[PDB]
Amino acid sequence: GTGYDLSASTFSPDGRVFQVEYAMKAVENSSTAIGIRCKDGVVFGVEKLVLSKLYEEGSNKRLFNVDRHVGMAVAGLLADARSLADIAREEASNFRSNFGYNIPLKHLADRVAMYVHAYTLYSAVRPFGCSFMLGSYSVNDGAQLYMIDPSGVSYGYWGCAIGKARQAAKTEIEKLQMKEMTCRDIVKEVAKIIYIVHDEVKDKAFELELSWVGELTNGRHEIVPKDIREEAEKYAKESLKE
Amino acid sequence: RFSPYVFNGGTILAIAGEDFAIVASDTRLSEGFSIHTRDSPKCYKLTDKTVIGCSGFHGDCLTLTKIIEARLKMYKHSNNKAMTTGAIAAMLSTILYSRRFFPYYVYNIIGGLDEEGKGAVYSFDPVGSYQRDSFKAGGSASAMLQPLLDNQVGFKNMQNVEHVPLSLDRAMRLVKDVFISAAERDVYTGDALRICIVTKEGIREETVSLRKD
Amino acid sequence: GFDRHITIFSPEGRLYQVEYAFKAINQGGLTSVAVRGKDCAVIVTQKKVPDKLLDSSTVTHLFKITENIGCVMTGMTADSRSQVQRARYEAANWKYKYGYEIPVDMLCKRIADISQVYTQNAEMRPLGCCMILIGIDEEQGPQVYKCDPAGYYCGFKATAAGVKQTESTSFLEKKVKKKFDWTFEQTVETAITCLSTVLSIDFKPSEIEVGVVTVENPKFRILTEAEIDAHLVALAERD
Amino acid sequence: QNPMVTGTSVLGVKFEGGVVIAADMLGSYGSLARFRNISRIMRVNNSTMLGASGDYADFQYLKQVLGQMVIDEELLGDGHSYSPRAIHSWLTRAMYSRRSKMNPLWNTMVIGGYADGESFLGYVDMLGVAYEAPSLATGYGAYLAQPLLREVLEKQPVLSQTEARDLVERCMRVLYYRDARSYNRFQIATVTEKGVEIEGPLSTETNWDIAHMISGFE
Amino acid sequence: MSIMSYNGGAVMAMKGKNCVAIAADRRFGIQAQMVTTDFQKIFPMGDRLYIGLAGLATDVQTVAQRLKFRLNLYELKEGRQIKPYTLMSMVANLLYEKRFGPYYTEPVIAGLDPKTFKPFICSLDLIGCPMVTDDFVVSGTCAEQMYGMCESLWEPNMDPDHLFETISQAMLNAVDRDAVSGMGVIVHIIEKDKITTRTLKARMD
Amino acid sequence: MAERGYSFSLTTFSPSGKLVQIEYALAAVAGGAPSVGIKAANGVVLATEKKQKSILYDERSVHKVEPITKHIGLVYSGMGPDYRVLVHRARKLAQQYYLVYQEPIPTAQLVQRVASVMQEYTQSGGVRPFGVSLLICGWNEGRPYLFQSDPSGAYFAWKATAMGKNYVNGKTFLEKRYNEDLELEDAIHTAILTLKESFEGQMTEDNIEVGICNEAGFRRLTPTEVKDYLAAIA
Amino acid sequence: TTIAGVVYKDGIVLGADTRATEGMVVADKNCSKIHFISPNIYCCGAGTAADTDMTTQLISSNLELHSLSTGRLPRVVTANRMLKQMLFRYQGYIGAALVLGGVDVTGPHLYSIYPHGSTDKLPYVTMGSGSLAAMAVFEDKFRPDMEEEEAKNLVSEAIAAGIFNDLGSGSNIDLCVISKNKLDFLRPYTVPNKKGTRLGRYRCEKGTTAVLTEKITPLEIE
Amino acid sequence: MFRNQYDNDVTVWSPQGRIHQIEYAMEAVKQGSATVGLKSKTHAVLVALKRAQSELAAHQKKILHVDNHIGISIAGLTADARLLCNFMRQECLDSRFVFDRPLPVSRLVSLIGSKTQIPTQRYGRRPYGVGLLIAGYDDMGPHIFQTCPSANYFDCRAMSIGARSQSARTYLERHMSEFMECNLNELVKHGLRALRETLPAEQDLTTKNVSIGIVGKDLEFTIYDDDDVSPFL
Amino acid sequence: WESREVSTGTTIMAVQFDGGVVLGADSRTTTGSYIANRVTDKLTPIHDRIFCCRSGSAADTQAVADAVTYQLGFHSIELNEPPLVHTAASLFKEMCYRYREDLMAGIIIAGWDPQEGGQVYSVPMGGMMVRQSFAIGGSGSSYIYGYVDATYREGMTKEECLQFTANALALAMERDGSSGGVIRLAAIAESGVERQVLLGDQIPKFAVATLPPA
């Protein structure tokens, strides 16, 4: 006995508790999501592993919305992410009406940041084991991308990625342009990255999922399915087969 | 301040057979000298050969009706078994006895058929209370119509020479005749007349229009 | 004694758990230093990143608590950010209620009491952070107050932060004999110099983050590159 | 609760291709024209339209709760569900509760819209009485205007002869002339089966003999 | 008539040199119907300190008992005596709580401190404001008249024997003022060596 | 939780019949910088040592003597944060209770309140008692003064006492030297000597803090004033 | 009563009229509505006596707590706001017109509070039942560049005008000069008309009064 | 070891980050009865096995009429299930009062989930150890969901709970394509066959244990009970 | 309201121009011939860009003003840069609505930001939040309505606006009311906030009175 799995309201010889490290191991144990921000907007893309044919998606995904201007994606356990999220939209909404403004991305983050840190000080409520990726395009500020960790740490990003693949993805991402052309071009590019990432994950099929907040979307949050998803896929299939 | 009492009631007539019942009502709804709406009954089919009508105010009338319907659904879920008329009769009263603090009210009547192969009609006061009927007219125009209705349909007063037993057909003729007559004596009766006819086959509705001036 | 799910009085005289907060309070390699003059009070920090897939225009460890007051935090990030939010509310409230400005010292003492209770609970731990308060008072002049999360706070002639504090202390004492002989900028220069010796890094324009409090202004400002480079250039000339 | 800054006369009808609504633009404080050219038009969703009369402060309060309804749930909160028959009921319940506290509101509202095949035009009042009728008018309009409108809208084939706007336009002129607690400007909005359209700032038209007989100024 | 007047009553205190005096009425009836010519409305707490209360009788009984509770416990904790001043304060705090309610009482404090050897008097109001009295103190419904008499009759130096005449006549004048027939009165004459109690002879109906 | 946790106390009856946590606090007390108190009868003297350990300090910033009231003052040995907090609650209670009344504070009553707060924490769990020992110093009239308050919750009267490191040894020195009539200036000389004997790391006019209760209660000595006494007899 | 405040460049003078009235009869000839809330923040209070005292005691308490915690000189503006906040919550019952004055290193400041919850700052202020009479004299009489003696003469006149014109005010006048270098409480500055007259009454022993019951109680414990 | 440790913490996290509580919960679903779920997506059927403890008893129901357009089969202990069912009926009642709409069963299922999940996220709550196959006929057709006491909500076109669930799954995948968007009759036959796969298969088919329940385009909630399944056999 | 009632003329307006907004208002509050309050401000900084005109009862208005300041102060430090528009307006509304009928506030909130320019919002007693081209307030409006109708000026100059407010307010106080004294003004621009003060003897003999603003 270590004497501190039992707690979650105290210090340890490692400082923070073992329970908090573990929550960080579990997100990495999940699938793989990336995000790329640009000057015209921000793109989200996520890999979903296929289980069997019986099943079908219709309310359980991995891409989630916040409000009606905010895009949300996560790694970790599905049920818990959904629980965090329903409350966030609601908290955002009371603000939205009350101050009369359409909430910032930055303010939303602060509100979530504070919740998670409070749960680390107590042993009443075990933490979430998710990592949440959020961001959009603000009409007068730009695109801003943030990622919040279960480790009580959050930052503003040009790219962020999570999953088993994390290290490797950030390397490829790191290789590319700051501007990265136009958003549309990025839809194709992100698809190559996922396409190639899957050779490393391949034990069964996958489904490619892409989303966007674009200048053309006019800052709203929408999914990219349709022919648009398929072309980016064809371009990856031509280039390599991996 | 603002009112805690507004009238809106019509006039209705409930007639009890011994294997059927009819509950008939004007569509005209008014208050005073301005007309609220030239349509809509206050008689409704609750279902399963129970017909109900709540005279007093429209705001109260919809709300009671909706609410009862859930208690019946819940009950059946709780174990398969349904309220009888009598059961429903107690259920409305408790609601009213609560509402004795509430300042809006209604004059309710329930009708349907028993499994004794005859009608039961129970009528409530707007404080609670129940009584067993043979026939009841409710609403505004009721007070004037009823002695005559009691005598023509009934023959149970100490002022008639004979009896005759009811017939459905005969009940229908009398009902139309009372309403057509009611209309030039009120401005709470008029326009059209909606008849709910209750039999053991099922619930039928008939409509006939009346005068207006 | 039993640290296992409770914290008690011990013959140890301290608590293993309180020491552990003192020990790991940084998990990176930043170091900080703060000096006080009568011309300025300056805090010098770093800017460092691991990659460039990250932004650096929102990344900061210097907080503007309010116009007059500034706060640099040494602590776990989660804990540093929480405490700021709590403080921001408490200050504002003190302004509303009293109608007058909140003294720097007053905040440090108030916050200290909040730390202390948590030390009594064996159902909750204190936040892990050392908070350095700096400000310009009109009631004693500029003021520099450091807190530690034992409930201890005190005002110092200058102080240093990071894991190499004692090493920085040695330079500081030498310096602190004479420091009222420094003019404005020359305060700043010396301040850069003592972090560069410890840390053993001759700074670069995007690695350093000097924050200055300025007397005869209620400004706390982080300095522009031109001024920051002007200093850096200034030490070259004496080498 | 009690009137403060109030609006009167909101007229509406149903027609083949839609529903048509018209309302003046006034915020009177008894008789002082505090606001001239003030909206009363809340688009609900894009396929339903609420015209509101009564207290203007109270109106603002209600607009926000309506606003929360679609910025929530995975899909939009007035998207797949929430039909106008539902939106009507939801509104009626809200009056009902206030009246039960006897801390009341002070508005009469018309919810107008299209369902998916059928015209929706439904009434709510401070009394809280709920109905659907093909013709509605509020305020002064409820007494005076509504028998003029009724001749057209109680005869169902004659409705079918035309798009309604003209009856509306005409009534509103008679209304402005007889009442000077009303203002010369109005807005008219049409909810069609798939679309919604607002015609902005109009002023009453000057009649032939009627203009000589009666004017609109004091 | 009022919320204090159903049984009326008046109370006087006058100061002398080297002594103090408190005089009061007695009578209890029920409304206007006199049943008995007794009812003390003055109580003392320790020999020398006297407290006279003037509300409704009902109120008076409850208030006198409250002051006992408080004072005894207070005395116990500090473990040394209470002063006259201390009693005055205490009354104020109690007076403040009753202000929302229909218990309205006028107290008057009198006593001569004999661990300090100074005379002490105060009056207190039924809205709770303490007003430190001098030379004469009034209470009762008759107060306007009573005040008139006290300003006239007093002379700057007084001996217990002169003080006795002054209060007696004051008391005599006072009983004629009652419409409630408040007949019977007591005097207590206080010295820091002696107390005299006198019931006085007066009109009888 | 938010109401769960440990309802019973950490401290527990032993088959010893001693209270473990309580025992530890005598140790907690032990660690304190040297403290003394002399009652000059007409006056009162309390004194302690400010240790110093970082040259980096400002002013004479925080004290170790704070005024509760204008008539009573506290000084202590034990843990500093506990002291600040202890003073705040009491300080609040002293003003509120004695502005209901206009009478000035009796000494015993403050002691009764400090001990209760200390004792409730012994009764209840979740929170631990404070591990400080106080010297309640005041002046008022012709009453006795100079009182001691334990982390135990117990109180005692004294004429003289000592706290801090080597408490037993200093008290034995104190016992012999302190007798009969003395003067307020004289009591200060002695207290410095008794503190020096316990330990001197040095003494300056900033290693010492002396306060007295005499004319109109508590008065704070100037730094020069004390220094005059150091020269008056080192 | 009438309470007034006049500010000058090296201090403030506050003055008030001493007199408590019940009915048409005088409840207190001598009384004191000059209150200590602080050693440099004073308020005079008028109105309901019971409301005035209760506030003085609460506020004094709150301020005193602040004064020790901070270790610095307090502010009057804070004292004004703690009073102002109180009135808004009760929503009326209180009938106290207070003139809160104070001298600081920040300047002399002078405020009034009206039980409605309204306060203002003016170079001179007065409240009283007498207020309307004093105010007429004041406007005329006020000139800027006042100093101590000029203020004092003006303030003394000011109270003297309220005594004469207002029938519910009478008796002695109290003045208090608050300087940021000294405090002076001026006990009866003017002494006008007296309490009553001797209309005769002579004395004789206890024996001339027929007594019902006589009793003793020796008191040996003082 | 530390088996008792992992029971004692409902806030448990291990080196491998597993949560044992969920694990326990899964074993409890497998302890229950046999139930299948099937849909064509224009009709939906569920064959459910209702069993009896002994000879002199008669079978206990595991098909619950939750509503007159929505319903469930339970698989796990009877007592907890009753408690959940009241909450869901009342949630249907206010939908009817206020909104007068049935409300998507999809929307409903998701809401119930949260309220359970949050007490696992803190002190108290043991697992409820009943899994469900929830059916209902909504606006966009019938839909099928599996609710788990792990609050794992999934829509499937067919599913199964009961020991040897996998067996029947493999047959469902095989026959999956044959199901199409027609025939009532066919779905039931496959179910009767499939249900045989779930059982040990030494037990022969019986008409007293089986029970068949349908909802479909013009259908609402109906149960075929005992002998009544023989007509459709 | 709590224990006052005003029965005298009030006269306030904010008038918009290119650079921003200029605010004017009378000074002194009065209840009757006896002077309730002497020459005072109600042109209040609750921010450096954000000012208000208070009207009605003094006690209520003072309380509202500090309360907003607290909220905006917390809001400013963390979101950064406050615009007037949705954000000031709602916070004042909620209170007016909640405190309902025990509240008497007529506020013109006027602000200048480079974010959308200057704005003018008017709190009536119902607490409607209305963006106005420019607004006139008070009871004295009734006197000014006619002037503005007659003149029909358009086009703004800092100088032109200063005369406009000066004749209107001056007249309003003259016929009725017992409000007067000083008229005080703030022209709010990117320069900063400029304060004008005009004596009650320098404020008559003006003209001009725009109604179309373009």
Domain boundaries, chain I: 10-211
Tokens of A161: 């990625």
Amino acid at G171: S
What does the alpha-carbon distance between residue B113 and residue A3 come to, in Å, rounded to a whole number?
73
| Cβ within 8 Å of G, I 92-121 | 102
- The answer to whether the Cα torsion of B170, B172, B176, B181 is positive or negative is positive
Alpha-carbon gap, residue C4 to B204, rounded angstroms: 78
**CA I65 – CA I91 distance, rounded (Å):** 10
Q: Which domains are assigned to chain E?
A: 2-205 (3.60.20.10)
I2/G117 CB distance under 8 A: yes
C-alpha atoms less than 13 angstroms from C-alpha of E181 in its C-beta half-sphere: 12
**With contact defined as beta carbons under 8 Å apart, do F218 and F66 qualify?**
no
Q: How many CA atoms lie within 13 A of H172 on its CB side?
A: 30
Does the distance separating the beta carbons of A98 and I86 come in below 8 Å?
no
**Rg (chain G; Cα; Å):** 22
Q: Give SS3 for B38.
A: coil
Residue of G nearest to F100 (CA): G57
Q: Which residues, 6 or more positions from H117, have their beta carbon under 8 angstroms from its beta carbon?
A: A79, A80, A83, H151
CB-based touch H/D (3+ pairs, under 8 A): yes
Q: Report how far residue G91's alpha carbon sits from residue G95's, in angstroms, rounded to the nearest whole number.
A: 11
C-alpha torsion sign, points H93, H95, H96, H97: positive
D45: left (phi over 0), alpha (psi -120 to 50) or beta: left
D213 Cβ contact list (under 8 Å, min separation 6): none
Beta bridge mates, C161: C32
Whole-number Å distance between alpha carbons of D112 and D118: 11
F211 in Cβ contact with F194 (< 8 Å): no
CA dist I57 and I37 (Å) reads 11
Question: Is the CB of I127 less than 8 angstroms away from the CB of D57?
Answer: yes
| F100 at E interface, C-beta within 8 A | yes
The C-alpha of H108 sits at a distance from chain D's nearest C-alpha, in angstroms, of: 12
Residue-wise DSSP of chain H: --HHHHHH-SS---TT---HHHHHHHHHHHHS--EEEEE-SSEEEEEEE---SSTTS-PPP-EEE--SSEEEEEES-HHHHHHHHHHHHHHHHHIIIII-S---HHHHHHHHHHHHHHHHTSS-------EEEEEEEETTEEEEEEE-TT---EEESEEEESSSHHHHHHHHHHSHHHHTT--HHHHHHHHHHHHHHHS-SSSPP-TTTEEEEEEESS---EEEEGGGGGGG-
Structure tokens at I48: 């450096």
CA distance F125 to chain E (A): 28
Cβ contact I163:I207 at 8 Å: yes
Give me the residue from F102, F106, F109 closest to E89, CB to CB.
Answer: F102
F175 in helix, strand or coil? helix
Assess contact for E26 and E41: CB atoms under 8 A.
yes
3-state secondary structure chain A: CCCCCCCCCCCECCECCHHHHHHHHHHHHCCEEEEEECCCCEEEEEEEECCCCCEECCCCCCEEEECCCEEEEEEECHHHHHHHHHHHHHHHHHHHHHHCCCCCHHHHHHHHHHHHHHHHHCCCCCCCCEEEEEEEEECCCEEEEEEECCCCCEEEECEEEEECCHHHHHHHHHCCCCCCCCHHHHHHHHHHHHHHHHHHHCCCCEEEEEEEECCCCCCCCEEECHHHHHHHHHHHHHHCCC
> Where residue A193 sits, what CATH number does that domain have?
3.60.20.10
Q: Which amino acid is at I56?
A: G
Partners of residue D188 on adjacent β-strands: D22, D199
Say how far apart CA B47 and CA B202 lie, in whole Å: 9
How far apart (Å, rounded) are the C-alpha atoms in residues H155 and G73?
Answer: 71
Beta carbons of G203 and E162 less than 8 Å apart: yes
φ/ψ of residue G44, rounded to 5: -115, 150
Q: Which residue has the tokens 């135990």?
A: F152
Whole-Å CA distances, I117 to B134, I111, I161? 78, 8, 18
Which of C116, C121, C173 is facing F81, going by the closest CB pair?
C116
Query: Residue A134 sits in which domain range?
Result: 1-239
> Do residues E164 and G206 lie in contact, with contact meaning Cβ atoms separated by under 8 Å?
yes
Rounded distance between C-alpha atoms, residue H167 and residue C61, angstroms: 59
D129/A145 Cα distance (integer angstroms) = 50
Catalytic residues of I: 10
Are I7 and I31 a contacting pair, CB within 8 Å? yes
Q: Distance from first CA to last CA of chain F, Å, rounded?
A: 60
Tell me which method was used to determine the 3D structure.
Answer: cryo-EM
**Could you list the residue range(s) of the whole structural domain that residue H143 is in?**
4-233
C-alpha to C-alpha distance for H64 and B79, rounded to whole angstroms = 11
d(CA D65, CA D71): 11
The domain segmentation of chain G, as residue ranges, is: 2-190
Its sign, for the CA torsion H81, H82, H87, H92, is positive
**What is the token pair recorded at I91?**
């916070």
Give the separation between CA D61 and CA E95, rounded to whole angstroms.
Answer: 47
Please tell me the distance from the alpha carbon of residue D119 to that of residue D206, in angstroms, as a whole number. Answer: 33
E137 and E123 Cβ atoms separated by less than 8 Å: yes
If one counts the domains in chain D, the total is 1
The shortest C-alpha distance from F25 to chain E (Å) reads 29
Contact F99 G68 (CB under 8 A): no
SS3 F177: helix
Residue that is written with structure tokens 């071009």 in the block: A185
Tokens representing residue I1 in the block: 């309201």
Nearest Cα residue to C172 out of C141, C147, C151, C146: C146
| Contact residues for F92 (Cβ-Cβ < 8 A; gap 6+) | G65
What is the distance between the alpha carbons of residues G184 and I112, in angstroms, rounded to a whole number?
51
Concatenated DSSP letters of D112-159: EEE-SSSEEEEEE-SS---EE-SEEE-THHHHTHHHHHHTTSS-HHHH
Resolution in A: 6.8
Interface partners of chain A (CB pairs < 8 Å, 3 or more) are C, D, F, H, I
Domain CATH for H29? 3.60.20.10
| Strand-pair category, D32-36 with D41-44 | unpaired
Bin H226: left if φ > 0, else alpha if -120 < ψ < 50, else beta: left
- Which of E147, E149, E82, E157 has the alpha carbon at shortest distance from E116? E82
Classify residue I133 by burial, with Cβ atoms within 10 Å: 0-12, 13-18, 19+. exposed
Burial (CB count <10 Å: 0-12, 13-18, 19+), residue D132: middle
Q: How many CA atoms lie within 13 A of G214 on its CB side?
A: 6
Contact status, residue E200 vs residue E164, Cβ threshold 8 Å: no
How many domains are contained in chain A? 1
CB pair distance less than 8 Å for A55 and H110: no
Structure tokens at G151: 């203020």
Q: Max alpha carbon distance in chain G (Å)?
A: 72
SS3 C50: coil
Amino acid at A217: T
**Signed CA dihedral, I152, I154, I156, I159: sign only:** negative
Can you say how many angstroms the Cα of residue C87 is from the centroid of all Cα atoms in its chain? 15
Neighbours of E73 (CB within 10 A): 10
Chain H CB within 8 Å of residue D80 CB: yes
Q: Does the domain spanning I10-211 belong to CATH 3.60.20.10?
A: yes
Residues 42-101 of E with CB under 8 A from F: 77-79, 83, 85-86, 89-90, 93
How near does any CA of chain G get to the CA of C70, in Å?
20
Instruction: Return d(Cα F4, Cα H82) in angstroms, integer.
Output: 30
What span, in angstroms and rounded, lies between the C-alpha atoms of A178 and D183? 59
C97 chain-G contacts, CB cut-off 8 A: 81
Task: Write out the DSSP string of E106-157.
Answer: -EEEEEEETTTTEEEEEEE-TTS-EE--BSEEEEES-HHHHHHHHHHH--S-
Beta-carbon separation of F109 and E93 below 8 A: no
* DSSP H or E stretch at residue B86: helix B85-98
* Sheet with G213-218, edge to edge strand ranges: E136-140, E10-16, E19-25, E185-190, E194-199, G213-218
- Contact between chains at D96 and B63 (C-beta distance less than 8 A): yes
- A-chain residues within 8 Å CB-CB of D64? 97
- In which residue are the tokens 């804990």 written? C79
Distance from CA of F1 to the nearest CA of A (A): 5
Give the bridge partners for D114, in sequence order: D119
Question: Do E55 and E124 contact (CB within 8 A), yes or no?
Answer: no
| Nearest Cα to Cα of residue I79 among C88, B65, A203, G63 | C88
> Tokens for H148?
């788990």
Active site residue G1: yes
> Hey, CA dihedral for G130, G136, G141, G145, is it positive or negative?
positive
For chain C, which domains are there? 1-238 (3.60.20.10)
Which amino acid makes up residue H16? Q
How many CB atoms neighbour CB D31 within 10 A?
7
**Are G68 and F91 inside 8 Å of each other by CB?**
yes
Q: For residues H89 and B74, is the Cβ–Cβ distance under 8 A? A: yes
Rounded Cα distance, E95 and E89, in Å: 10
Nearest to H101 among D73, D86, D93 (CB): D86
- Tokens read off for G147: 């100093």
CA distances from D103 to D1, D98, D100, D106, E154 (A): 6, 6, 8, 10, 64
Q: Which two tokens stand for residue D170?
A: 């005409």
Pair A162, A33: CB distance under 8 Å:
yes
Q: Indicate the residue type of E143.
A: A
- What range defines the domain where residue B17 resides? 1-213
E87 φ/ψ angles, rounded to the nearest 5 degrees: -65, -40
Q: Residue F104 half-sphere exposure, CB side, CA atoms within 13 Å?
A: 11
Interface of chain I toward chain A, CB-CB under 8 angstroms: 75, 78-79, 85-87, 89-91, 94
CATH number at residue F88: 3.60.20.10
Sheet holding A63-66, edge to edge: A63-66, A70-76, A130-138, A142-148, A154-157
Q: How far apart are CA H161 and CA H171, in angstroms?
A: 14
Alpha helical stretches, state H, I8-81:
58-78
Q: Rounded to 5 degrees, what are φ and ψ at E170?
A: -60, -45
Q: Compute the distance between CA of residue C128 and CA of residue C83 in angstroms, rounded to an integer.
A: 10
Q: Do E197 and G53 touch (CB under 8 A)?
A: no
Strand E185-190 and strand E136-140: the pairing is unpaired
Q: Distance (Å, rounded) from C-alpha A79 to C-alpha A90?
A: 18
Token pair of A176 as six digits: 């590319």
| Burial (0-12, 13-18, 19+ Cβ within 10 Å), D179 | middle
Distance of CA D191 to the CA centre of its chain: 12
Rg (CA), chain D: 17
Name the CATH superfamily, with its identifier, for domain G2-190. Answer: Aminohydrolase, N-terminal nucleophile (Ntn) domain (3.60.20.10)
Q: Look up residue G20 and give its DSSP letter.
A: B
- Kindly provide the b/e burial profile for residues B143-160, where b requires at least 16 CB atoms within 10 angstroms of the residue's own CB: eebbeebbeebeeeeeee
CA of A62, closest CA in chain H: separation in Å?
Answer: 13
Tell whether E118 lies on the interface with F, counting CB pairs under 8 A: no
Residues sharing a CB contact under 8 Å with residue B109, sequence separation 6 or more, in sequence order: B12, B14, B23, B52, B53, B54, B55, B121, B122, B123, B124, B136, B138
Kindly report the three-state secondary structure assignment for every residue of D171-217. HHHHHHHHCCCCCCEEEEEEEECCEEEEEEEEECCCCCHHHHHCCCC
The two tokens of residue E70 are 């408080």
Range of the domain at D157: 1-215
